[PDB]
Amino acid sequence: KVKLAVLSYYKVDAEGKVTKLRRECSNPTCGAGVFLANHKDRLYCGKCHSVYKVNA
Amino acid sequence: KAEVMKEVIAKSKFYKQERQKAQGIMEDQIDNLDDNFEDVMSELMMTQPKKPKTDLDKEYDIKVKELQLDKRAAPSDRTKTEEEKNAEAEEKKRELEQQRLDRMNGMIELERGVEDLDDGFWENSISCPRTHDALLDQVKKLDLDDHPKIVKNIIKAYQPKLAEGNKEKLGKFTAVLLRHIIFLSNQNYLKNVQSFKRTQNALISILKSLSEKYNRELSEECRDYINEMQARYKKNHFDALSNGDLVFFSIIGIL
Amino acid sequence: ALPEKVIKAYTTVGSILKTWTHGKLPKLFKVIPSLRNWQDVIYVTNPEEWSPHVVYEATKLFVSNLTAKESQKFINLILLERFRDNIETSEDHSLNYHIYRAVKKSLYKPSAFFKGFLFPLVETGCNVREATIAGSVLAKVSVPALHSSAALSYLLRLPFSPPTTVFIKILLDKKYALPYQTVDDCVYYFMRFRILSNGEDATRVLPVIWHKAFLTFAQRYKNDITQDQRDFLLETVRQRGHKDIGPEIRRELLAGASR
Amino acid sequence: VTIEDALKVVLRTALVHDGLARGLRESTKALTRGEALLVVLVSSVTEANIIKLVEGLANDPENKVPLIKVADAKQLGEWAGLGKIDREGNARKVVGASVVVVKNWGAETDELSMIMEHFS
RNA sequence: UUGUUGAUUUUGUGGGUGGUGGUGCAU
Numbered sequence: 001k002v003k004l005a006v007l008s009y010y011k012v013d014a015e016g017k018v019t020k021l022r023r024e025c026s027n028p029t030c031g032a033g034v035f036l037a038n039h040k041d042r043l044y045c046g047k048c049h050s051v052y053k054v055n056a
Numbered sequence: 057k058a059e060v061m062k063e064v065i066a067k068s069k070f071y072k073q074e075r076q077k078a079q080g081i082m083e084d085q086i087d088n089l090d091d092n093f094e095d096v097m098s099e100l101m102m103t104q105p106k107k108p109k110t111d112l113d114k115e116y117d118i119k120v121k122e123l124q125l126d127k128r129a130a131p132s133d134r135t136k137t138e139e140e141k142n143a144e145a146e147e148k149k150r151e152l153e154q155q156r157l158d159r160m161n162g163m164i165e166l167e168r169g170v171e172d173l174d175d176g177f178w179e180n181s182i183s184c185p186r187t188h189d190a191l192l193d194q195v196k197k198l199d200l201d202d203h204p205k206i207v208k209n210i211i212k213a214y215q216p217k218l219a220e221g222n223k224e225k226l227g228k229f230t231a232v233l234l235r236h237i238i239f240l241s242n243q244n245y246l247k248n249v250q251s252f253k254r255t256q257n258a259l260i261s262i263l264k265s266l267s268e269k270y271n272r273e274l275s276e277e278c279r280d281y282i283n284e285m286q287a288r289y290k291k292n293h294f295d296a297l298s299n300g301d302l303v304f305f306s307i308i309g310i311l
Numbered sequence: 312a313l314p315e316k317v318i319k320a321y322t323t324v325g326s327i328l329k330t331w332t333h334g335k336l337p338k339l340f341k342v343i344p345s346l347r348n349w350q351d352v353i354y355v356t357n358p359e360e361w362s363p364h365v366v367y368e369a370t371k372l373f374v375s376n377l378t379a380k381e382s383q384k385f386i387n388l389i390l391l392e393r394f395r396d397n398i399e400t401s402e403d404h405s406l407n408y409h410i411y412r413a414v415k416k417s418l419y420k421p422s423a424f425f426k427g428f429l430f431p432l433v434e435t436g437c438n439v440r441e442a443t444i445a446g447s448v449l450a451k452v453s454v455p456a457l458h459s460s461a462a463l464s465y466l467l468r469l470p471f472s473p474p475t476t477v478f479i480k481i482l483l484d485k486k487y488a489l490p491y492q493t494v495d496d497c498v499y500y501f502m503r504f505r506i507l508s509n510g511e512d513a514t515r516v517l518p519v520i521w522h523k524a525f526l527t528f529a530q531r532y533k534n535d536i537t538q539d540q541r542d543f544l545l546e547t548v549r550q551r552g553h554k555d556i557g558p559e560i561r562r563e564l565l566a567g568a569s570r
Numbered sequence: 571v572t573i574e575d576a577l578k579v580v581l582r583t584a585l586v587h588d589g590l591a592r593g594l595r596e597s598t599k600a601l602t603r604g605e606a607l608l609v610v611l612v613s614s615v616t617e618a619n620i621i622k623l624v625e626g627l628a629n630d631p632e633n634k635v636p637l638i639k640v641a642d643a644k645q646l647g648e649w650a651g652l653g654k655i656d657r658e659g660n661a662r663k664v665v666g667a668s669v670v671v672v673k674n675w676g677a678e679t680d681e682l683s684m685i686m687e688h689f690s
Numbered sequence: 691u692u693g694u695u696g697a698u699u700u701u702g703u704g705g706g707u708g709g710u711g712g713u714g715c716a717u
Binding site for chain 2: 534563
């Protein structure tokens with residue numbers, strides 16, 4: 001089990017600016033807010049199960 | 057007859073091979089489609105379409121939350137008739153009576169017999185107290201007549217359902233309670249015999265309820281008290297023997 | 312229309328689903344829930360011609376992935392129809408095991424199941440055999456008390472039909488902790504068959520299933536109704552009590568304490 | 571009608587229409603999607619990083635969403651419906667909700683106007 | 691807890707159930 005996994009996906013700057021550290025799944029079923037899992041060779045979606053290249 | 061059996065065996069085999077051939081064809085098709093997934097998915101992805109609840113559906117969501125707010129009822133079972141309860145109670149008396157009779161005859165439950173045992177013998181908030189002192193730790197400041205109240209509260213505070221492991225805590229408490237009952241008898245009580253009688257029988261009643269569910273834990277403690285008192289008899293003889301030892305042999309017969 | 316290449320690919324997927332019995336599904340079939348137009352993609356796979364094994368795995372695949380609103384369409388349009396089609400066309404009017412397991416899988420999502428399978432069925436000419444088969448699934452699978460209480464309340468508001476009375480009996484047989492709002496509605500249901508001005512339910516003949524359901528309620532929630540509700544239900548028996556069940560129901564009502 | 575007593579029927583009404591995003595994960599998904607209309611945050615969150623983030627997402631220039639400060643997470647969990655109701659009348663087994671976000675309001679009440687007026 | 695998901699499960703203690711069971715009988 002991973003605790004506060006959501007916290008890791010995005011970051012704060014001292015000015016309150018929020019930045020996303022993970023790419024979001026392009027699938028409109030996923031819509032916005034579905035973050036791809038970052039593997040060594042591929043980006044994986046937990047909802048659509050689609051596979052994207054890391055540097056695509 | 058034999059030729060019919062061979063045809064049946066041959067037909068079954070001929071049917072089995074067809075199924076295996078069909079299974080292989082199905083697996084081959086699956087492999088080809090999986091290889092073509094990416095081409096199919098991409099074209100499907102490009103042609104994807106662009107982005108009021110039923111009145112019945114609206115009511116259900118309203119109901120669900122309203123039912124969440126409301127209180128819930130406790131379920132009860134059908135009441136058995138007095139004859140059925142008596143018939144059941146009369147039955148349960150029968151097997152227990154029969155079970156006791158067989159054991160007087162030598163039936164041993166592990167259903168072995170006494171003769172089997174005689175082979176080789178001759179040739180060769182509220183705190184649960186895990187220890188007898190710990191039970192007193194909660195009960196120094198309480199009066200003699202208050203012992204049943206605290207003891208009962210300990211069982212209530214650590215019932216099996218409340219948390220995991222409460223079975224073990226109560227089982228150890230069963231052994232702890234037994235030593236307390238013995239411990240009180242050894243203590244002088246001529247001053248307050250009536251108060252002692254109000255505690256001494258009450259604790260035994262609690263122990264009986266505990267023994268019904270913790271006979272295993274009680275029996276282990278009972279053996280340990282049995283084993284200990286020879287050792288005191290092994291050095292002190294009667295000076296080891298006290299009122300509580302007389303009390304102990306009484307309680308064993310009860311439980 | 313879908314891309315012609317896609318149509319050919321999913322057409323071959325469907326042909327596999329016709330005879331599929333075991334193993335891994337075609338990977339194309341696996342990702343259908345993740346598509347917006349899964350309905351269109353599902354149509355080209357011929358849901359009516361899916362083997363019972365495919366229906367079981369398809370229910371697993373779609374109930375988990377699709378949203379609650381979308382799973383209701385899948386249960387309503389495919390699983391409900393297949394459940395009806397198999398019962399109607401089977402020689403013994405029995406349900407296939409795989410479809411019987413699929414309906415359990417769809418029950419993993421109570422809201423979609425209730426709005427997609429049960430409520431459409433009872434409101435669309437459900438028959439006794441359908442209710443018995445569906446009721447058995449509801450009997451064995453664990454269902455939430457909250458979701459069931461809402462479902463039982465609605466069935467207690469529908470017009471009387473023996474197929475609906477079975478599901479009312481099943482839900483009562485579950486021995487749930489119904490909220491008193493549901494209990495009052497349950498009292499109202501049986502209060503609507505007494506002779507008073509009243510509707511045809513007062514003079515309507517009552518099968519044994521109605522009496523068994525009323526005995527089922529009496530044996531359990533006798534401790535969760537008011538004294539006035541007890542009197543209303545007690546005199547309902549006096550007017551509509553059964554020969555043999557009725558006297559037993561009287562005993563259970565009188566043995567209960569008012570809340 | 572106090573603001574806190576106003577937020578009582580608020581989070582209850584939004585529940586009836588399935589318009590509440592419950593949890594840090596759901597709240598952030600609502601904010602990133604622009605589906606959030608109101609944000610309720612707990613001042614007593616042990617990890618300040620959670621506070622910095624919902625504030626940042628709520629204050630994003632593209633989609634500014636009103637934010638509300640609440641003393642305890644346990645009571646918001648009760649308002650979000652997490653807790654269970656007992657025989658007596660009091661809530662029990664309540665699960666603290668650090669963040670709650672309103673997606674769809676469901677019904678138009680007078681309690682709306684005060685909260686929206688307060689922010690304006 | 692599911693397979694990403696959101697309370698639908700998991701855990702411990704108690705616990706009712708023979709039931710998509712058959713065969714005959716009486717409109």
